[PDB]
Amino acid sequence: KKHLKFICVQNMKMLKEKNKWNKRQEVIDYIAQETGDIRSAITTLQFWATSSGSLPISTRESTISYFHAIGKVIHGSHSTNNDNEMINNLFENSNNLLSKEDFKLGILENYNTFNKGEFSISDASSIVDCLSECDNMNGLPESNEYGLREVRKTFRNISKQGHNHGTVYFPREWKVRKLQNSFKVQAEDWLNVSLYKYNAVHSFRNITLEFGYYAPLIRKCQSYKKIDVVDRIGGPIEA
Amino acid sequence: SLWVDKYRPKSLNALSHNEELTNFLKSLSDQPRDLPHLLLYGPNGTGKKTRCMALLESIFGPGVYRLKIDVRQFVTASNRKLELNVVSSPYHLEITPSDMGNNDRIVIQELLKEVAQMEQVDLAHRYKCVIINEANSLTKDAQAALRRTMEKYSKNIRLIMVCDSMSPIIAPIKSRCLLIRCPAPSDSEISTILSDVVTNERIQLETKDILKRIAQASNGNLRVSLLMLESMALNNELALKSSSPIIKPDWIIVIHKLTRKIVKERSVNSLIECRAVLYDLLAHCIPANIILKELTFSLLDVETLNTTNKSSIIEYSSVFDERLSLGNKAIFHLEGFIAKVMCCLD
Amino acid sequence: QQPWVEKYRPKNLDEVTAQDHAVTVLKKTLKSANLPHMLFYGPPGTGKTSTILALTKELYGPDLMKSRILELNASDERGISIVREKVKNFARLTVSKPSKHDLENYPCPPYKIIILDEADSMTADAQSALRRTMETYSGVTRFCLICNYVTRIIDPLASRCSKFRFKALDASNAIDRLRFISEQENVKCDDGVLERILDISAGDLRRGITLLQSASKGAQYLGDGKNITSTQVEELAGVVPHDILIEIVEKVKSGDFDEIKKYVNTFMKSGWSAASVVNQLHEYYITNDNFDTNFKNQISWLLFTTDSRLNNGTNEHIQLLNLLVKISQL
Amino acid sequence: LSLQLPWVEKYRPQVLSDIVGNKETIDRLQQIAKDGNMPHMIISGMPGIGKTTSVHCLAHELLGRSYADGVLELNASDDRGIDVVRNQIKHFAQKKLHLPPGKHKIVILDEADSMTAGAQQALRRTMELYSNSTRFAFACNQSNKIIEPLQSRCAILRYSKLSDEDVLKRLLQIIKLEDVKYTNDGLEAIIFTAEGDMRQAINNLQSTVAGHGLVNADNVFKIVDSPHPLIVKKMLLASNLEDSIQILRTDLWKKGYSSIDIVTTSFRVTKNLAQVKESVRLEMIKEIGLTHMRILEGVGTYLQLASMLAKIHKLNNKA
Amino acid sequence: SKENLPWVEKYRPETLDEVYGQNEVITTVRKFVDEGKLPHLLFYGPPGTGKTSTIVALAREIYGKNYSNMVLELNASDDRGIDVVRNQIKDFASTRQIFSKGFKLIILDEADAMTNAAQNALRRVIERYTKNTRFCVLANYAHKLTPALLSRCTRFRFQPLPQEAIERRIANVLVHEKLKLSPNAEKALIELSNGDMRRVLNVLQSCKATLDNPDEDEISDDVIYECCGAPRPSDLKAVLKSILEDDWGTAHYTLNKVRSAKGLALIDLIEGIVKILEDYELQNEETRVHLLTKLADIEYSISKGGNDQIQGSAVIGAIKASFENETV
Amino acid sequence: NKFSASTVHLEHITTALSCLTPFGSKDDVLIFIDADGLSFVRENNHVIKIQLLLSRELFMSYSYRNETEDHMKLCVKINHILDSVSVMNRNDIVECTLSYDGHGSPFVLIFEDSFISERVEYSTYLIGLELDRERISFEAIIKGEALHSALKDLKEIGCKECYVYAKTEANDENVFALISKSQLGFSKIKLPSNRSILEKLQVFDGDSTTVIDGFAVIGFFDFTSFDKIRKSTKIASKVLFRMDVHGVLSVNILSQPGIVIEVCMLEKESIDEAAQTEIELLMET
DNA sequence: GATTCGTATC
Ligand SMILES: Nc1ncnc2c1ncn2[C@@H]1O[C@H](COP(=O)(O)OP(=O)(O)OP(O)(O)=S)[C@@H](O)[C@H]1O
Ligand SMILES: Nc1ncnc2c1ncn2[C@@H]1O[C@H](COP(=O)(O)OP(=O)(O)OP(O)(O)=S)[C@@H](O)[C@H]1O
Ligand SMILES: Nc1ncnc2c1ncn2[C@@H]1O[C@H](COP(=O)(O)OP(=O)(O)OP(O)(O)=S)[C@@H](O)[C@H]1O
Ligand SMILES: Nc1ncnc2c1ncn2[C@@H]1O[C@H](COP(=O)(O)OP(=O)(O)O)[C@@H](O)[C@H]1O
Ligand SMILES: [Mg+2]
Ligand SMILES: [Mg+2]
Ligand SMILES: [Mg+2]
């Protein structure tokens, strides 16, 4: 607002020539509220000033971030009381972000941040049920549309005043993938040790089920009454 | 070596838990030339692989147990390097295509069509068997290559694939194979096997009841029961008493604790804690199908739930198992099952 | 020597049984030369690969066959690029000349056949590519598509290809062929068997032949020199005994959840197949006169849902327990 | 076999005065033509509403006799990679050409929505380095496909859908210049089937004239087909299931419409569909998605579509 | 050697007068040819309705002899990526015409198989070289075509063939092949065709092959059903009557007996019963919803394969249960 | 054998098949066979056609023992030949024998090194641009080396598009130039009027009968198509140009009976004719 | 988009 005012007070003659100086303040406020881009704001102001008609003031649309989209899906959007139009514009403008598995994972991870998890379990069951159903459509646009619409409707029917929401976080799936990769490496090492030391071929499923716990236990008992792999595969489990 | 491998029956006459299945295997192995393609299906740990190896020993003689392991390289559409381990002995081959994921089709094509066309003349021609462990894990694309591979090249190769719950095996594959059912041993036979093991191992046993307890706790799993036996043998200084605790895997204990928590506290925060526990389970590469199965059958063992709650739990478990079969991310369906259970319990 | 399925595969169109419609059309095409593009579809083990191989042999003979036939199946890559290059190049190819012996002994029609077996495994892109390749070269090349599920074949290709549905081989359809095979392999069967084999093997002669071979191997290993009984056939076909099924039915009748759960646990320890026991339960419940129409409607839908869920590679234990619990509350 | 240009290209406007529709935008473009200080601009909107013609008319009215070597029109049909952008655009912008006092070179980038991102970054460098000598005019269908760093430098002009009055006026001009016989209801039908598209209206009018001569409702509707999105909306909003089924059958199945097309149009209609509750709308979206999956897997019969309609009526009728 | 071809690509029309069914499209394209102006056409419709035949006949009529060097035809069998559109199509529609003069034709058969990049490139080729070249876009699915590409094309819709067109083509083929056809066989063929002429020609070829002496014997509906392997209408009516009226055991027995009499499939019975029930006047409206939903689920499961007896009993149970609301 | 032809100068077949290399490297090549000789005709995009002819006197043996049809037509993939005939010559007679046994028979190419006979059989596949000789806008006869240098320079420059100038004069100041449009823009490559390079240049006014002076002929050609003739000009001695009114450029290359090459090209529609005025003004300047 | 904390201004 301050800098657009400076540009106007440096173009008073022309601005005063076209009698647009009695209106410049409202358009400056509108431009400042619409964009956070100084160059685009000044370009739009120049287009409005040099024009001689009733052309609408149009500025470039800024993209919506990941957590911004998550918050818009969860808590809704201010100035847009229509869920349908908000979700529609979200899909048209940010289809690259919304058409991903990471967005559904983010919704699943962050839907508990509404009122610090202090809402009915029926709503949570409905949300996760809809997400699971959407997971059975293999990236069709209808899946994402239905999932986001259902999440928004569920959180709208329970939203009231006096809510103190939490802070969203990125899904921890990559952590689980890294842990699974470490498990795969350890299981490969155990299988490699489990052939040349003693002739035996064990399937990976058995390694994950029984040999990841019982074989390290045996080797630890053997360690105490005395083989390379003595600790549990994947580390110990907790809770 | 483990007691599961130390006392593995190396001959068709050394199998002493099913008898009738042994008679059928001997009938098959009397004339190996007309041997069809076999499909061994039965509960996990009953001994299907031992039966396959015993049949192979009956056909090709001793030496099928001299396994050589080599790494063979593959290339996918995106030209990435994949390394499948092929446990190869003379007279037969072992392949686990599930070592690769959806990329097992290229293995079933390259590696198997290589040996199917390649004859085994050395003026005399023999057929070399190929063992496919975990036939269920094939992705309906490996099986489609498999069917024509074994139909057209039957003269040179024979397929013996082992699996449990052969429902995810397509109809063309099932129609092309001889279906061999391998039932799990009863508690008496498991106890007898454990008695032979402890006798050959010089473990001091207080009473024979503590072997029936192992057999009952393993739920008809020979390998699991033998691993429990070795565990309490090496955790009790080779002297087992009735006070010796029945030991169960860590993930089973975690699932039982999760069941207790789900029955006790039913809120969204409890749901988040259950999600954390499920993520920890998945971090240990425990497949989500068996996670859901164990969760369901631990929730059906709680005595505080009436018949309506148990029926709702089993219905939701079936629905979400079908969802998990067709899904891509397991956490959605696991969380949905837990949320439905927590919503129906109250 | 060989498994009886590959040993008794038909060599000419006369050996193919119970599919008279397609086989007469193809036999009449033998004396003509206007063979269309054919779409062979039907249940597994119904005689489609046998029919196409027998026709191709009767057409070209052992010699011309190697030069006038291209076979693509699911064991080889059949992507969009492969369809656009290799299939189009083979269709473009001029018709190789027959020899004197081929010209006199075999009909040798003036065209080549491209057989695309397991065509239901091809993506819709490859089939769209195949559309005009099939069309614009219809005078020099003929296309045969074989599949079990027609719906996996896109509508254009289904329109271009002439459709030949292969019927399921019931007891009536394949009883003569099974008798032929049994007699030529010296199989002593009790009366009633060779019909139980075809009833268990619903619409599948490969399964029936393998069942007969396994029963013969058992009866030969016994050395007892007695006939094969239906009980043995049901035993090694995976059929649950009637007493176990009766126990299942009686535990369902007394609708106690814990009793059913324990029984299902032991039964699934016994290693049975959930699809087979579900089928047997269907037969028992739908054919029983002790139940009313409403119960039968509900049980039919429950069995349909359970079969559909089992066809998706789900957990047999959970599906069977849920089905039996639902039946207990009907 | 002969020589006669189609009316779409025979009647393409050559001056900004002949372009109908967005009066304010066209007036602003005329002002730019007269003063000559053209800024970087982005033109976006629906297809066939006078975006390319506006750009080319502005270029002609701004460059005059220097249009021959003053514009560099690059389009989707031409290669527009990073190397092409760099070399050609840089050499064109570095070309020192003396122009009238208030004039600049113009670089028309039609179909800029189909340009690789790295080429857009190179365009950023060229735009911010040679801006004093040349100006850029982007023609696109949606401004989202132009990266934000490029939209920062441009004055965004959005072309709205053509109103029925403007398309009627242009149709009347073309009619009174080609001497076709017409009826008021015929032009109304052409307007209705055009659906805010001038190119489609011209094509339909020419097709009707060629096929039958007089342009009335009967000829137009016997040669052109009513927009199937409207039929889909009519069938989705039907009160009872029998009427919806009958509409589907007799208006989309007998007419020869693909089931996948019907399903996709149903989804698009449901996205923009008022007078329905959010829960009902998302339930309809879910059922349409399930039916779309069944169609994609090969089960694309009329039974699947009838079942989808039945499920929609269950959810929206409390049945 | 036109006697060495399948009936489908033996009776392909060579002239526009031989394309039946699409009276309006043919009349309008003939007028376009006569007036000398041809726009950018877009032919859309179901498979086997006369799109490729129409466009090839039209191109032959426009360029009787120069067809080889006047028409560029591309289809799904040829690669049509961004490079192909940029090079081959542009260079064809950028050079002067052969012989005296004319306009070049570029036919894009099965253009719904083209990527969006190729269509986006093609749109400016269409708009820029239209003075001497016209495009024809053939497509079964219009949702795979970019909205701009649809905008710059003149849309002609090919309806499924009516009864009269198929009857006329059948008469032509019968005269050509010296075949006979009973009126009931004609009706059966009309119903099985479902607006497709390739299906009619294939079925007729199989019917001629079925006959022992195709020079004396006719073709009745019995031959039609035997060769095509479809349930007779009487069988469908009997199965539906047994399901609706009789009890469960006899309904199941009747279904199995009817199926085993001629080896009928369950999906054919399902489609026949659905066609019969669509004429039924239901009085509860929930009877229709249940029928449609249950039968669609059964049809989908059948498409994925599985137990045939279970699916058949499911069909019987679904029908009897739904018709419970009718009396309510 | 229906057709048989043996030769010892395989350098002719090598250079000949390299003359089709500037065209599609992976496509099919159409081969006519007749008593006068066999010809390798190739076509690209319906807009350019090369036609290279090996006469009967080229081969020491040429039989054509067939009478049912005047000519034999067979189409084979070009790079099957290119891959197969990569024999690296030998030094051994290396005699090459071409055979064809009618329809349904492969095209055979036998190579004998007096011990080794590497016989290769090529599978045959399923099977226009001619200028109307009565109407020729202009006709020019140039030396091969000058034209080769011109195309080499035009390729050095890139030359997105090219132009041809032909304007004879009253004082016989015949001018023939290759105008390009490239990164540099308009570059004029004019060939000299000397009889050493340009031996004849007649520009007609239609019907190819009247030698009219003071008027110019402009040919707008796509340079990707104009480059296909470059490798043929390398072995050429005299290159003959013949452009008609229908926008067809025919190049008559003969490496003196040697080999004869017929390259026919379709000329661009020239959307805007302002460039034509620009080119002629650049010329007269 | 929400929360928390900190500024700056009126
Ligand atoms: N009609 C038949 N007459 C004779 N043998 C048959 C017939 N149908 C099937 N068979 C036998 O079934 C076995 C395999 O049948 P195939 O026709 O080769 O397989 P299929 O019909 O293609 O089934 P797929 O490939 O799984 S869909 C062979 O042993 C055949 O002899
Ligand atoms: N406002 C208009 N006034 C007059 N003719 C118009 C108008 N809009 C479109 N046309 C006609 O449409 C044709 C050219 O339309 P274009 O402006 O090229 O379409 P477009 O707006 O560029 O849409 P796209 O994105 O390029 S498909 C010519 O035949 C014009 O006569
Ligand atoms: N209107 C018609 N009149 C006569 N025969 C027709 C007609 N429409 C189709 N046919 C027949 O159908 C055969 C193939 O139909 P085509 O029209 O060539 O294919 P199509 O219409 O392009 O359908 P798609 O989209 O390519 S699957 C032709 O060879 C004719 O025998
Ligand atoms: N008849 C038997 N007697 C003794 N041990 C047995 C017998 N059958 C199986 N086992 C033991 O069971 C263990 C695991 O069985 P395994 O073959 O791995 O089952 P699966 O084939 O289901 O994986 C083996 O280590 C083997 O020693
Ligand atoms: Mg087969
Ligand atoms: Mg445009
Ligand atoms: Mg077509």
PDB file of N, CA and C in Angstrom, chain B residues 27 31 34 43 109 113 144 147 151 158 166-167 175-176 181 183-184 219 301 310-311 318 321-322 325, chain C residues 3 6 9 73-75 148 204 206 213 217 221 258 261 269-270 272-273 309 312 315-316 318-319 322 329:
ATOM      1  N   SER B  27       3.615 -92.440  -4.665  1.00  0.00           N
ATOM      2  CA  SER B  27       2.903 -92.801  -5.887  1.00  0.00           C
ATOM      3  C   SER B  27       3.309 -91.900  -7.043  1.00  0.00           C
ATOM      4  N   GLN B  31       7.104 -93.273 -10.917  1.00  0.00           N
ATOM      5  CA  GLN B  31       7.448 -93.090 -12.328  1.00  0.00           C
ATOM      6  C   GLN B  31       7.655 -91.603 -12.583  1.00  0.00           C
ATOM      7  N   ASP B  34       6.469 -89.207 -16.245  1.00  0.00           N
ATOM      8  CA  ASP B  34       5.179 -88.580 -16.488  1.00  0.00           C
ATOM      9  C   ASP B  34       4.753 -87.660 -15.352  1.00  0.00           C
ATOM     10  N   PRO B  43      -1.217 -74.852   5.280  1.00  0.00           N
ATOM     11  CA  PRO B  43      -0.873 -73.823   6.266  1.00  0.00           C
ATOM     12  C   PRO B  43       0.628 -73.584   6.334  1.00  0.00           C
ATOM     13  N   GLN B 109       9.642 -64.284 -17.105  1.00  0.00           N
ATOM     14  CA  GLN B 109       9.857 -64.367 -18.541  1.00  0.00           C
ATOM     15  C   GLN B 109      11.296 -64.738 -18.874  1.00  0.00           C
ATOM     16  N   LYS B 113      11.871 -68.713 -19.201  1.00  0.00           N
ATOM     17  CA  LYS B 113      11.864 -69.054 -20.614  1.00  0.00           C
ATOM     18  C   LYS B 113      13.261 -69.407 -21.096  1.00  0.00           C
ATOM     19  N   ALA B 144       0.669 -65.127 -15.935  1.00  0.00           N
ATOM     20  CA  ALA B 144       0.232 -65.193 -17.324  1.00  0.00           C
ATOM     21  C   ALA B 144       1.351 -65.657 -18.248  1.00  0.00           C
ATOM     22  N   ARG B 147       1.877 -69.629 -17.404  1.00  0.00           N
ATOM     23  CA  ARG B 147       0.958 -70.651 -17.896  1.00  0.00           C
ATOM     24  C   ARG B 147       1.399 -71.187 -19.256  1.00  0.00           C
ATOM     25  N   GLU B 151       2.997 -74.802 -20.237  1.00  0.00           N
ATOM     26  CA  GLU B 151       2.173 -75.602 -21.135  1.00  0.00           C
ATOM     27  C   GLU B 151       2.952 -76.037 -22.369  1.00  0.00           C
ATOM     28  N   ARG B 158       9.858 -78.917 -15.392  1.00  0.00           N
ATOM     29  CA  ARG B 158       8.733 -79.262 -14.533  1.00  0.00           C
ATOM     30  C   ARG B 158       8.637 -78.231 -13.421  1.00  0.00           C
ATOM     31  N   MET B 166      -4.035 -70.629  -1.751  1.00  0.00           N
ATOM     32  CA  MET B 166      -3.793 -70.440  -3.177  1.00  0.00           C
ATOM     33  C   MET B 166      -4.921 -69.690  -3.880  1.00  0.00           C
ATOM     34  N   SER B 167      -5.759 -68.986  -3.121  1.00  0.00           N
ATOM     35  CA  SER B 167      -6.786 -68.150  -3.739  1.00  0.00           C
ATOM     36  C   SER B 167      -6.236 -67.051  -4.651  1.00  0.00           C
ATOM     37  N   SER B 175      -5.525 -74.723 -13.053  1.00  0.00           N
ATOM     38  CA  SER B 175      -5.986 -75.779 -13.943  1.00  0.00           C
ATOM     39  C   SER B 175      -4.835 -76.558 -14.558  1.00  0.00           C
ATOM     40  N   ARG B 176      -3.641 -75.980 -14.593  1.00  0.00           N
ATOM     41  CA  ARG B 176      -2.490 -76.589 -15.238  1.00  0.00           C
ATOM     42  C   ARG B 176      -1.613 -77.378 -14.277  1.00  0.00           C
ATOM     43  N   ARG B 181      -2.575 -81.085  -1.358  1.00  0.00           N
ATOM     44  CA  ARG B 181      -2.936 -80.454  -0.098  1.00  0.00           C
ATOM     45  C   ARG B 181      -2.063 -81.000   1.023  1.00  0.00           C
ATOM     46  N   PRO B 183      -1.859 -80.761   4.882  1.00  0.00           N
ATOM     47  CA  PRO B 183      -2.428 -80.314   6.156  1.00  0.00           C
ATOM     48  C   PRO B 183      -1.371 -80.202   7.244  1.00  0.00           C
ATOM     49  N   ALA B 184      -1.667 -79.355   8.225  1.00  0.00           N
ATOM     50  CA  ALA B 184      -0.783 -79.132   9.355  1.00  0.00           C
ATOM     51  C   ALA B 184      -0.834 -80.316  10.321  1.00  0.00           C
ATOM     52  N   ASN B 219       0.272 -73.244  17.197  1.00  0.00           N
ATOM     53  CA  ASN B 219      -0.871 -73.316  16.284  1.00  0.00           C
ATOM     54  C   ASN B 219      -0.524 -74.095  15.016  1.00  0.00           C
ATOM     55  N   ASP B 301     -10.596 -62.761  20.610  1.00  0.00           N
ATOM     56  CA  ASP B 301     -10.281 -63.525  21.809  1.00  0.00           C
ATOM     57  C   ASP B 301     -10.551 -62.756  23.095  1.00  0.00           C
ATOM     58  N   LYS B 310     -18.334 -58.978  18.223  1.00  0.00           N
ATOM     59  CA  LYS B 310     -17.453 -59.888  17.499  1.00  0.00           C
ATOM     60  C   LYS B 310     -17.899 -60.064  16.052  1.00  0.00           C
ATOM     61  N   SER B 311     -19.211 -60.149  15.818  1.00  0.00           N
ATOM     62  CA  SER B 311     -19.703 -60.250  14.448  1.00  0.00           C
ATOM     63  C   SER B 311     -19.383 -58.989  13.656  1.00  0.00           C
ATOM     64  N   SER B 318     -13.248 -58.608   7.239  1.00  0.00           N
ATOM     65  CA  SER B 318     -13.368 -59.135   5.883  1.00  0.00           C
ATOM     66  C   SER B 318     -13.427 -58.009   4.857  1.00  0.00           C
ATOM     67  N   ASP B 321     -10.018 -56.422   4.590  1.00  0.00           N
ATOM     68  CA  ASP B 321      -9.048 -57.301   3.948  1.00  0.00           C
ATOM     69  C   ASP B 321      -9.232 -57.296   2.439  1.00  0.00           C
ATOM     70  N   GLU B 322     -10.485 -57.304   1.972  1.00  0.00           N
ATOM     71  CA  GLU B 322     -10.709 -57.155   0.537  1.00  0.00           C
ATOM     72  C   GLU B 322     -10.214 -55.803   0.044  1.00  0.00           C
ATOM     73  N   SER B 325      -6.507 -55.949  -0.272  1.00  0.00           N
ATOM     74  CA  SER B 325      -6.064 -56.710  -1.435  1.00  0.00           C
ATOM     75  C   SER B 325      -5.984 -55.834  -2.680  1.00  0.00           C
TER      76      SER B 325
ATOM     77  N   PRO C   3       2.982 -86.056 -19.477  1.00  0.00           N
ATOM     78  CA  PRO C   3       1.690 -85.880 -18.808  1.00  0.00           C
ATOM     79  C   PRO C   3       0.557 -86.075 -19.800  1.00  0.00           C
ATOM     80  N   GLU C   6      -0.626 -83.120 -22.156  1.00  0.00           N
ATOM     81  CA  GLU C   6       0.169 -82.885 -23.353  1.00  0.00           C
ATOM     82  C   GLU C   6       0.290 -84.125 -24.226  1.00  0.00           C
ATOM     83  N   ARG C   9      -3.292 -84.181 -26.199  1.00  0.00           N
ATOM     84  CA  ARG C   9      -3.732 -82.966 -26.862  1.00  0.00           C
ATOM     85  C   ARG C   9      -4.165 -83.292 -28.289  1.00  0.00           C
ATOM     86  N   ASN C  73       2.508 -64.933 -27.178  1.00  0.00           N
ATOM     87  CA  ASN C  73       1.787 -65.270 -25.960  1.00  0.00           C
ATOM     88  C   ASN C  73       2.308 -64.399 -24.823  1.00  0.00           C
ATOM     89  N   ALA C  74       1.737 -64.585 -23.634  1.00  0.00           N
ATOM     90  CA  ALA C  74       2.033 -63.705 -22.510  1.00  0.00           C
ATOM     91  C   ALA C  74       3.456 -63.855 -21.991  1.00  0.00           C
ATOM     92  N   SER C  75       4.199 -64.860 -22.450  1.00  0.00           N
ATOM     93  CA  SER C  75       5.572 -65.060 -22.010  1.00  0.00           C
ATOM     94  C   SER C  75       6.569 -64.175 -22.746  1.00  0.00           C
ATOM     95  N   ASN C 148      -9.599 -65.674 -22.072  1.00  0.00           N
ATOM     96  CA  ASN C 148     -10.698 -66.151 -21.239  1.00  0.00           C
ATOM     97  C   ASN C 148     -11.742 -65.070 -20.992  1.00  0.00           C
ATOM     98  N   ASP C 204     -13.589 -77.976 -17.238  1.00  0.00           N
ATOM     99  CA  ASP C 204     -12.133 -78.024 -17.331  1.00  0.00           C
ATOM    100  C   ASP C 204     -11.726 -79.458 -17.633  1.00  0.00           C
ATOM    101  N   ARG C 206      -8.574 -80.215 -18.784  1.00  0.00           N
ATOM    102  CA  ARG C 206      -7.201 -80.359 -18.316  1.00  0.00           C
ATOM    103  C   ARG C 206      -7.172 -80.855 -16.877  1.00  0.00           C
ATOM    104  N   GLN C 213      -5.037 -88.953 -14.246  1.00  0.00           N
ATOM    105  CA  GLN C 213      -3.656 -89.424 -14.219  1.00  0.00           C
ATOM    106  C   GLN C 213      -3.175 -89.647 -12.794  1.00  0.00           C
ATOM    107  N   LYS C 217      -1.989 -93.129 -11.167  1.00  0.00           N
ATOM    108  CA  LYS C 217      -0.687 -93.297 -10.531  1.00  0.00           C
ATOM    109  C   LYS C 217      -0.834 -93.889  -9.138  1.00  0.00           C
ATOM    110  N   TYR C 221       0.558 -97.515  -8.000  1.00  0.00           N
ATOM    111  CA  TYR C 221       1.535 -97.633  -6.923  1.00  0.00           C
ATOM    112  C   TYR C 221       1.047 -98.590  -5.849  1.00  0.00           C
ATOM    113  N   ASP C 258     -18.293 -68.458  19.371  1.00  0.00           N
ATOM    114  CA  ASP C 258     -17.024 -69.040  19.799  1.00  0.00           C
ATOM    115  C   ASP C 258     -16.846 -70.457  19.263  1.00  0.00           C
ATOM    116  N   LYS C 261     -15.894 -70.110  15.678  1.00  0.00           N
ATOM    117  CA  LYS C 261     -14.526 -69.614  15.559  1.00  0.00           C
ATOM    118  C   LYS C 261     -13.514 -70.726  15.798  1.00  0.00           C
ATOM    119  N   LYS C 269      -6.658 -75.072   9.903  1.00  0.00           N
ATOM    120  CA  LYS C 269      -5.439 -75.825  10.171  1.00  0.00           C
ATOM    121  C   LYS C 269      -5.372 -77.080   9.313  1.00  0.00           C
ATOM    122  N   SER C 270      -6.528 -77.648   8.962  1.00  0.00           N
ATOM    123  CA  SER C 270      -6.555 -78.841   8.119  1.00  0.00           C
ATOM    124  C   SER C 270      -6.147 -78.568   6.676  1.00  0.00           C
ATOM    125  N   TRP C 272      -7.666 -77.052   4.015  1.00  0.00           N
ATOM    126  CA  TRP C 272      -8.602 -77.069   2.901  1.00  0.00           C
ATOM    127  C   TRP C 272      -8.569 -75.746   2.142  1.00  0.00           C
ATOM    128  N   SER C 273      -9.164 -75.758   0.952  1.00  0.00           N
ATOM    129  CA  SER C 273      -9.284 -74.560   0.132  1.00  0.00           C
ATOM    130  C   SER C 273     -10.621 -73.888   0.409  1.00  0.00           C
ATOM    131  N   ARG C 309     -15.068 -62.024  -2.990  1.00  0.00           N
ATOM    132  CA  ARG C 309     -13.956 -61.593  -2.148  1.00  0.00           C
ATOM    133  C   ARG C 309     -12.794 -62.575  -2.217  1.00  0.00           C
ATOM    134  N   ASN C 312     -10.416 -62.281  -5.157  1.00  0.00           N
ATOM    135  CA  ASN C 312      -9.521 -61.134  -5.119  1.00  0.00           C
ATOM    136  C   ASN C 312      -8.229 -61.415  -4.366  1.00  0.00           C
ATOM    137  N   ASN C 315      -7.774 -63.127   2.441  1.00  0.00           N
ATOM    138  CA  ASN C 315      -7.432 -64.113   3.459  1.00  0.00           C
ATOM    139  C   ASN C 315      -8.545 -65.146   3.563  1.00  0.00           C
ATOM    140  N   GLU C 316      -8.204 -66.414   3.324  1.00  0.00           N
ATOM    141  CA  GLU C 316      -9.211 -67.470   3.309  1.00  0.00           C
ATOM    142  C   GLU C 316      -9.847 -67.659   4.681  1.00  0.00           C
ATOM    143  N   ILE C 318     -10.271 -65.439   7.236  1.00  0.00           N
ATOM    144  CA  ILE C 318     -11.181 -64.352   7.587  1.00  0.00           C
ATOM    145  C   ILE C 318     -12.458 -64.436   6.762  1.00  0.00           C
ATOM    146  N   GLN C 319     -12.319 -64.673   5.455  1.00  0.00           N
ATOM    147  CA  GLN C 319     -13.490 -64.745   4.592  1.00  0.00           C
ATOM    148  C   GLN C 319     -14.400 -65.896   4.991  1.00  0.00           C
ATOM    149  N   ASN C 322     -16.124 -65.116   8.392  1.00  0.00           N
ATOM    150  CA  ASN C 322     -17.175 -64.122   8.211  1.00  0.00           C
ATOM    151  C   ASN C 322     -18.387 -64.725   7.517  1.00  0.00           C
ATOM    152  N   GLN C 329     -26.418 -66.261  11.507  1.00  0.00           N
ATOM    153  CA  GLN C 329     -27.369 -65.236  11.909  1.00  0.00           C
ATOM    154  C   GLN C 329     -28.479 -65.030  10.889  1.00  0.00           C
TER     155      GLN C 329
END
